[PDB]
Design an enzyme around this catalytic site. Sequence first.
Site, PDB file in Angstrom:
ATOM      1  N   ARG D  61      85.970  37.678 -29.078  1.00 43.78           N
ATOM      2  CA  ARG D  61      84.580  38.101 -29.176  1.00 43.78           C
ATOM      3  C   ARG D  61      84.452  39.561 -28.758  1.00 43.78           C
ATOM      4  O   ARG D  61      83.476  40.230 -29.097  1.00 43.78           O
ATOM      5  CB  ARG D  61      83.706  37.226 -28.279  1.00 43.78           C
ATOM      6  CG  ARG D  61      82.235  37.237 -28.641  1.00 43.78           C
ATOM      7  CD  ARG D  61      81.425  36.485 -27.602  1.00 43.78           C
ATOM      8  NE  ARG D  61      82.140  35.317 -27.094  1.00 43.78           N
ATOM      9  CZ  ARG D  61      82.556  35.177 -25.838  1.00 43.78           C
ATOM     10  NH1 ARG D  61      82.331  36.138 -24.950  1.00 43.78           N
ATOM     11  NH2 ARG D  61      83.193  34.072 -25.467  1.00 43.78           N
ATOM     12  N   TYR D 114      62.103  44.928 -44.115  1.00 45.63           N
ATOM     13  CA  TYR D 114      62.794  43.745 -44.601  1.00 45.63           C
ATOM     14  C   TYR D 114      62.076  42.540 -44.004  1.00 45.63           C
ATOM     15  O   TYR D 114      62.034  42.382 -42.783  1.00 45.63           O
ATOM     16  CB  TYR D 114      64.252  43.762 -44.146  1.00 45.63           C
ATOM     17  CG  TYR D 114      65.097  42.726 -44.837  1.00 45.63           C
ATOM     18  CD1 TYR D 114      65.355  42.812 -46.203  1.00 45.63           C
ATOM     19  CD2 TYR D 114      65.629  41.647 -44.132  1.00 45.63           C
ATOM     20  CE1 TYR D 114      66.120  41.852 -46.854  1.00 45.63           C
ATOM     21  CE2 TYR D 114      66.397  40.678 -44.773  1.00 45.63           C
ATOM     22  CZ  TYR D 114      66.639  40.789 -46.135  1.00 45.63           C
ATOM     23  OH  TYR D 114      67.401  39.843 -46.780  1.00 45.63           O
ATOM     24  N   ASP D 187      68.062  52.521 -41.252  1.00 43.91           N
ATOM     25  CA  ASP D 187      68.800  51.471 -41.930  1.00 43.91           C
ATOM     26  C   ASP D 187      69.067  51.942 -43.348  1.00 43.91           C
ATOM     27  O   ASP D 187      68.321  51.623 -44.271  1.00 43.91           O
ATOM     28  CB  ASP D 187      67.989  50.182 -41.956  1.00 43.91           C
ATOM     29  CG  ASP D 187      68.748  49.036 -42.586  1.00 43.91           C
ATOM     30  OD1 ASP D 187      69.549  49.293 -43.509  1.00 43.91           O
ATOM     31  OD2 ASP D 187      68.546  47.880 -42.156  1.00 43.91           O
ATOM     32  N   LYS D 212      75.634  43.791 -48.487  1.00 47.32           N
ATOM     33  CA  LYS D 212      75.259  44.309 -49.798  1.00 47.32           C
ATOM     34  C   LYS D 212      76.224  45.230 -50.543  1.00 47.32           C
ATOM     35  O   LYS D 212      76.967  44.785 -51.414  1.00 47.32           O
ATOM     36  CB  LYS D 212      73.897  44.996 -49.693  1.00 47.32           C
ATOM     37  CG  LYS D 212      72.931  44.297 -48.756  1.00 47.32           C
ATOM     38  CD  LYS D 212      72.031  43.326 -49.505  1.00 47.32           C
ATOM     39  CE  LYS D 212      71.378  42.332 -48.549  1.00 47.32           C
ATOM     40  NZ  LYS D 212      70.729  43.042 -47.408  1.00 47.32           N
TER      41      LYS D 212
HETATM   42  O1  LIG Z   1      61.961  40.204 -49.981  1.00 48.59           O
HETATM   43  C1  LIG Z   1      62.491  40.572 -48.894  1.00 48.59           C
HETATM   44  O2  LIG Z   1      62.042  41.524 -48.194  1.00 48.59           O
HETATM   45  C2  LIG Z   1      63.717  39.862 -48.369  1.00 48.59           C
HETATM   46  S1  LIG Z   1      64.635  38.941 -49.655  1.00 48.59           S
HETATM   47  C3  LIG Z   1      65.269  40.295 -50.603  1.00 48.59           C
HETATM   48  N1  LIG Z   1      65.531  40.229 -51.920  1.00 48.59           N
HETATM   49  C4  LIG Z   1      65.989  41.427 -52.299  1.00 48.59           C
HETATM   50  C5  LIG Z   1      66.402  41.825 -53.669  1.00 48.59           C
HETATM   51  C6  LIG Z   1      66.657  40.835 -54.664  1.00 48.59           C
HETATM   52  C7  LIG Z   1      67.050  41.216 -55.977  1.00 48.59           C
HETATM   53  C8  LIG Z   1      67.189  42.597 -56.300  1.00 48.59           C
HETATM   54  C9  LIG Z   1      66.934  43.587 -55.306  1.00 48.59           C
HETATM   55 CL1  LIG Z   1      67.107  45.283 -55.701  1.00 48.59          CL
HETATM   56  C10 LIG Z   1      66.542  43.206 -53.999  1.00 48.59           C
HETATM   57  N2  LIG Z   1      66.002  42.210 -51.205  1.00 48.59           N
HETATM   58  O3  LIG Z   1      65.540  41.525 -50.062  1.00 48.59           O
HETATM   59  C1  LIG Z   2      69.419  43.002 -47.067  1.00 50.29           C
HETATM   60  C2  LIG Z   2      68.978  43.628 -45.810  1.00 50.29           C
HETATM   61  C3  LIG Z   2      69.266  43.041 -44.436  1.00 50.29           C
HETATM   62  C4  LIG Z   2      70.000  41.688 -44.338  1.00 50.29           C
HETATM   63  O1  LIG Z   2      71.303  41.773 -43.793  1.00 50.29           O
HETATM   64  P1  LIG Z   2      72.162  40.432 -43.577  1.00 50.29           P
HETATM   65  O2  LIG Z   2      73.510  40.902 -43.270  1.00 50.29           O
HETATM   66  O3  LIG Z   2      72.134  39.705 -44.925  1.00 50.29           O
HETATM   67  O4  LIG Z   2      71.495  39.660 -42.516  1.00 50.29           O
HETATM   68  C5  LIG Z   2      68.836  43.679 -43.291  1.00 50.29           C
HETATM   69  N1  LIG Z   2      68.129  44.844 -43.411  1.00 50.29           N
HETATM   70  C6  LIG Z   2      67.783  45.479 -44.617  1.00 50.29           C
HETATM   71  C7  LIG Z   2      66.918  46.722 -44.457  1.00 50.29           C
HETATM   72  C8  LIG Z   2      68.238  44.830 -45.871  1.00 50.29           C
HETATM   73  O5  LIG Z   2      67.810  45.477 -46.992  1.00 50.29           O
HETATM   74  C1  LIG Z   3      84.811  28.854 -23.539  1.00 55.44           C
HETATM   75  C2  LIG Z   3      83.371  28.603 -23.371  1.00 55.44           C
HETATM   76  C3  LIG Z   3      82.308  29.355 -24.136  1.00 55.44           C
HETATM   77  C4  LIG Z   3      82.723  30.431 -25.137  1.00 55.44           C
HETATM   78  O1  LIG Z   3      82.472  30.054 -26.472  1.00 55.44           O
HETATM   79  P1  LIG Z   3      82.793  31.085 -27.652  1.00 55.44           P
HETATM   80  O2  LIG Z   3      82.640  30.330 -28.893  1.00 55.44           O
HETATM   81  O3  LIG Z   3      84.254  31.498 -27.457  1.00 55.44           O
HETATM   82  O4  LIG Z   3      81.848  32.189 -27.458  1.00 55.44           O
HETATM   83  C5  LIG Z   3      80.979  29.087 -23.939  1.00 55.44           C
HETATM   84  N1  LIG Z   3      80.624  28.132 -23.030  1.00 55.44           N
HETATM   85  C6  LIG Z   3      81.498  27.371 -22.250  1.00 55.44           C
HETATM   86  C7  LIG Z   3      80.820  26.416 -21.281  1.00 55.44           C
HETATM   87  C8  LIG Z   3      82.943  27.624 -22.441  1.00 55.44           C
HETATM   88  O5  LIG Z   3      83.721  26.858 -21.634  1.00 55.44           O
END
Ligand SMILES: O=C(O)CSc1nc(-c2cccc(Cl)c2)no1
Ligand SMILES: *Cc1c(COP(=O)(O)O)cnc(C)c1O
Ligand SMILES: *Cc1c(COP(=O)(O)O)cnc(C)c1O
Lengths: 396, 396, 396, 396
Positions: D61, D114, D187, D212
Amino acid sequence: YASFLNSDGSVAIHAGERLGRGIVTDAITTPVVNTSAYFFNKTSELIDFKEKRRASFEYGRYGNPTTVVLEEKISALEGAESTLLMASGMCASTVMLLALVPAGGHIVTTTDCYRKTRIFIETILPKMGITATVIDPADVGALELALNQKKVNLFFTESPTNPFLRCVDIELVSKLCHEKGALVCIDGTFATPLNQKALALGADLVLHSATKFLGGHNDVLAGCISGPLKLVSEIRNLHHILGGALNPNAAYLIIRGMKTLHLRVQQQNSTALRMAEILEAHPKVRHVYYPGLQSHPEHHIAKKQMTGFGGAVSFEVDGDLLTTAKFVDALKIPYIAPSFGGCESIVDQPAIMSYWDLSQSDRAKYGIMDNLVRFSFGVEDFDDLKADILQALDSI
Amino acid sequence: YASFLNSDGSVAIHAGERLGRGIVTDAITTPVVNTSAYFFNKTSELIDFKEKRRASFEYGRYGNPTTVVLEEKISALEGAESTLLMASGMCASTVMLLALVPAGGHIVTTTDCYRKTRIFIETILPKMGITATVIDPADVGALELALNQKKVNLFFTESPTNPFLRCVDIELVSKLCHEKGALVCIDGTFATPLNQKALALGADLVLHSATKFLGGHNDVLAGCISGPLKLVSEIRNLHHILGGALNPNAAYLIIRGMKTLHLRVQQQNSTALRMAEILEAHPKVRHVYYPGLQSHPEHHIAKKQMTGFGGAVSFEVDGDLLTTAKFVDALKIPYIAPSFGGCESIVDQPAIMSYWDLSQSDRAKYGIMDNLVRFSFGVEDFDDLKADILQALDSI
Amino acid sequence: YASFLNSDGSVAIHAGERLGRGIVTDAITTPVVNTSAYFFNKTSELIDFKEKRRASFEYGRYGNPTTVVLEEKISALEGAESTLLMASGMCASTVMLLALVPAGGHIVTTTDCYRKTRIFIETILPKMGITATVIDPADVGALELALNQKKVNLFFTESPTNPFLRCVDIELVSKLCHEKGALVCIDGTFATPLNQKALALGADLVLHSATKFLGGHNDVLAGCISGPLKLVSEIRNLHHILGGALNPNAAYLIIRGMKTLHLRVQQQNSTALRMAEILEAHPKVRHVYYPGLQSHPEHHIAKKQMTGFGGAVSFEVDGDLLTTAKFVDALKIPYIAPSFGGCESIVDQPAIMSYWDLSQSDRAKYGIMDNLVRFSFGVEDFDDLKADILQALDSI
Amino acid sequence: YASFLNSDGSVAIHAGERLGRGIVTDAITTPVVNTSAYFFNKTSELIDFKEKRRASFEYGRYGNPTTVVLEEKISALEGAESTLLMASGMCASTVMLLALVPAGGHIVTTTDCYRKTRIFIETILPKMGITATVIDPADVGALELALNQKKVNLFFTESPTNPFLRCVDIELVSKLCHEKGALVCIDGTFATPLNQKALALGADLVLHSATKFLGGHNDVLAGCISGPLKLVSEIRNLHHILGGALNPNAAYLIIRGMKTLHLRVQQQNSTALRMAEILEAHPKVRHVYYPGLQSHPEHHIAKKQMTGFGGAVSFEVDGDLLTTAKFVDALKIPYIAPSFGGCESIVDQPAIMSYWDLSQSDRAKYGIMDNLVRFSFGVEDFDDLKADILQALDSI
Ligand SMILES: O=C(O)CSc1nc(-c2cccc(Cl)c2)no1
Ligand SMILES: *Cc1c(COP(=O)(O)O)cnc(C)c1O
Ligand SMILES: *Cc1c(COP(=O)(O)O)cnc(C)c1O
Ligand SMILES: O=C(O)CSc1nc(-c2cccc(Cl)c2)no1
Ligand SMILES: O=C(O)CSc1nc(-c2cccc(Cl)c2)no1
Ligand SMILES: O=C(O)CSc1nc(-c2cccc(Cl)c2)no1
Ligand SMILES: *Cc1c(COP(=O)(O)O)cnc(C)c1O
Ligand SMILES: *Cc1c(COP(=O)(O)O)cnc(C)c1O
């Protein structure tokens, strides 16, 4: 395949996926199936399948859902009837041979060959009493001649060739061969289904070492053969026996790679060409090989059948063994190793890389000069590469 | 391997790891190396390696760090000099044959064989003019006889055999063969290095289909051959040409599986035995095959050379084709499919599963009765399994 | 899950698989789905799903076919309504907390806690104004007292505890808590769903760090929470936001590991006990902690609610910091590192391993002596292990 | 990073690899390390590490060799001091917030956000008494104003924005904020380190959803934050607690994906632009959003800080809810689903896709019209896509 898809790139991306997968999922990508076998719900069904009334792989060595995709994908690209996937090109070629060439049969192949592929023919095939004839890639006469002298079962060669990228006028050859009943199998590894469709040109079978370009990431080995069902199947069978099945994870990796095939090939094709000329013009560069240049013997054929010339370039440096080495040693971007076609650039000195086992004399027997240098242009930025190569020459 | 590790289990866990890995890491598990090739720092080094002064796999087909581990691991278990890993048992055996048996040579093998392995010998080897003699696993006479009649290059057979788990007195056979300069290759798939050390028994080469027990998860195919370097190497060479290399990811999965080999085998060995007797005593059960029972022909040999009897049991049901099917159809836990040795239990009706392609008559030519049933006991709980089996009998 | 299966092991093997997978395949194993999102055939369908008329994960962070399997699997074992899977135990507990405990809320927890888990409570929760009370695992009075003093939202603790494997009379505690409307969440990591079913004991939520035993291969991180839908879902929601989704490949590795859960746990449970006594009887061993021994405070409770005692054993060596080290340093089989529960044995000196950041005094505040030694008995052979341990005890 | 490497493309390929890996291997690619923990050779060493005299991850981790590569890789691209990798973008942003914004603190963010990111701020942060101010991306006045009214701890926003791709003059904003001690976190998911270097523009922290573009294969989730060590580390710490670690296999996939980052982005940027114009000019197209077009509000800023405009294009169709749907339903190439940036093209109707849970009225509160359509252009061939889109219009 599809109607709304016409460009190879688009195909290499959605071929055997966009529509269906026979593995049904609301997932965008192809799921990786890690099974060693396939079960049946009830004997009645098992019977149906065995009686050819149902569909199933039966055993992992007999196929895999994750694999068939990549299979169909390639098939679409090469525009073939069916495709088979081995564990590595070597396997592919190797098998394909034992598969189509009968005992005591005869085969024709070019002088320029992949070191290993050579040996198999010169040491294994003879056991099965299989004799073969070696001719120059261009020498059409010899082919036509041998075509008459003996009863050729199949003509096998890769185009572009290695390491001089000599090309073969497929269309022409296929004709001369098909006239005498011979089979034409081309190894368009260096080419790529994008740069040429050997099949459309008339070839009977085409095979590549996906290990190189198709996967283009230098992180997986795999071979594949594509062609008419009637033929490919025959191989698939023997394949099921020799058991050289390709692992799903590997298959996926390739499928993932092919997602950006065009994009890559394109970039590589360019960098290659430009650098080629630049190299040809360079003084310290004695000679350069590349179908893209006019200086290349079969350049005209290259133009007539190809739409690209790969990202591989061979050239002799104006120096000696030690000196040439000094050159490659100077390079800072490409990796010194065999293989090619990956995002990362690679270079090597055949003389050493894979011929050091031979004598300075026997080496020349194939044109392999301590001078020769192979360069698989990666996907890096041109300038960054050029600069490296050039700076590399300013050291002698 | 180690001086503080004697129990096979401990070995199957730390063999080729606990000490070193030649891949240096503070990680507990072996790292999965996904490379298609290996580079060199400078030409000088490439030369050294080519001149046999440095260590490297050169190409992905010539080896892999993640693989060699599993290689060394198995080597330690079977207590061999070296081990090789193919893409599948079939490949292994298939290769090993073309590797050791010369052209026009002769080989001896038992009647009870793996369907596929059979074909290879009956359709491919003849191509290389390789003739073979089929004898009963017990018929020592025939072996000794043929041992004199012709010039046997190698005697190949698996023990336990399939599907009747007939065993062969390795020690003895090894002697009789080595006396006439013949080679003894045993396929201890069903056995497992834990239940028997064919090598120590005198055998020259031992090979298993890791696809089964070694992996024991029904999620990967792999074959392997182990024995003296002088021998295995000869194969490795041909291997490098045929190119049937095993993908790293696969290798890992196996390595991961063997971590619990003993644990599994143990459980499997018991369930098998108990269930065997229980089955033998059952009225609806016509016959039962298992080296563990006294009813077994080579039972005495089984006791002398084995320490376990695997988790596979074959038996004929007191019924007909259709009836027997009705039996398997009744089972609720095992999967109906080929393969075996996985944590999940598996059943099948050879008559159909892999001989339906033959005639009712030709089928008997091998003892395959529409009666026979193969049961690869998984690792599930005994009671749970027994209850299932039994319940699936009253149905009849 | 199913009728014919009643033994935990059989479940851990076929739970959420044998019957169906909602991913349909003639494959034995669960296919690994590597997708970042899920598509829809047509808007009409998307509407249906959004209107809760169809089934789909929508986004990879909202679920995965390969995962739900492991999800249901665990659910079955723990005999729960539903289970959730995070990227790591820490994530789990951490989320679960911020998910159930309201702002300004109060929570009760034992003194013996996982270092990290502690901090989160002592440094993050306070930010949300969440106050907590620390009590002795045994001190039921304090719990009952605090249960009245303030308004507890949830009582959280792990049993066995760490590193003294102190156990808590769940059933009892659950009662006292539910009486005052408080929630009881038990971290049965050290226990494993096989050695105890905290849920059946009355607990509201049970969570383990699949990183240890469930995966038991020391090659993947993962956490999971199981319990009543009405509850788990509330967490899943917040989870979908914090986005700590577990990768499919990880899920699979776990599913693959649980295939031999019982097999392992069993072996581990034994080795532990035996070694425990042997250790307790040893002269150089000052003290030994293990619920299996009578010397253990809550030993009776352990017997009453557990069916095993894990494969973890803690003990103080008759020496000082430096000396104790010398002991561990002598060991040749276990690896010196955190974590535990894997096939490979592991050892560590808490005082250093994860408390060296504290003062010799502050260390004692928790009972962490430079004496104490944690030993996660792997799956290796007992004799091999014992011999190792003993031999290292003669070096002092 | 490396002198001989200047073009980002070349970096995205060899950054944190070509030179060294801290995992030493003659392998071209980065090895995938699957370990849950890391051991020590002897206590003495463990002490050193704990005393900060040695290097190690300690726990899985707390890091991973396979991961750090991708970490350093991204670091190089974004040209930052250090980068962190979570299990998903949501995790990233989510953690980052709780990490930097103190209790009772205040934060500023744009209206266009988002969906999920929004909720977290509107429902979780409040728990920690964290208040926030929502302003328009362009409204610099408001920002400057709020900058004075309250004591802002950090201004967070993404540029381009979603789903109108509104952009923010980083440089400017960074100035205004840094003047009041506020932090600036951008972002640039939609942008990509290739199309812009927010860090260079003055921003303090930049983060993307590698899910993405970085991965660009729609087969893996992952988030990442990059910036000054002094800052990022503070996050890494809290991350080690919340435990949202990214799985190695995930990391690799990304590393593999970035190998062709430039290649892709390039192709995407073009297809987007062209199509955009073509779309804007189309009659049935009411409006089109894309920083590449002049019609775009912050187009000038786009030009001044970006070198590309992404491959995402939003636009309103000249119809109603049902009609618009009929359009997307007509498309044959793109998949209807969330996410974007992958080789495969994607489309969706926000109104439904992720806002159907709201009222027709509340929907407009953010500009989300039943009209609007998001289109993430894949990497397919332009003509193929264009043809598809157009044809998908004459259907109205
Ligand atoms: O709608 C939201 O804010 C979260 S879900 C999400 N869908 C897409 C999205 C889906 C298709 C095309 C493009 Cl360009 C973007 N991007 O965020
Ligand atoms: C798509 C998107 C995310 C989502 O990220 P995940 O890795 O799928 O959780 C977060 N922030 C922005 C601004 C995005 O466009
Ligand atoms: C080892 C242990 C964790 C750690 O879990 P991870 O999946 O490695 O983060 C958490 N809680 C207890 C009580 C543990 O013994
Ligand atoms: O030497 C032989 O014939 C086989 S070994 C071989 N090396 C390369 C090779 C290596 C580096 C660059 C290029 Cl373009 C090719 N390809 O096969
Ligand atoms: O027919 C053959 O021998 C090849 S197909 C084959 N099936 C099994 C098999 C199937 C189920 C159980 C057992 Cl013990 C064995 N093993 O090989
Ligand atoms: O010190 C802590 O509490 C957190 S770090 C930790 N190490 C182990 C641990 C390490 C080796 C063996 C055994 Cl049985 C347990 N468990 O948590
Ligand atoms: C590289 C190459 C091969 C080797 O394929 P593998 O999959 O690595 O065994 C075969 N043929 C040609 C023409 C090649 O260029
Ligand atoms: C199952 C089996 C094989 C098949 O091995 P694969 O790896 O599945 O090709 C070969 N030999 C024996 C003795 C077997 O039991």
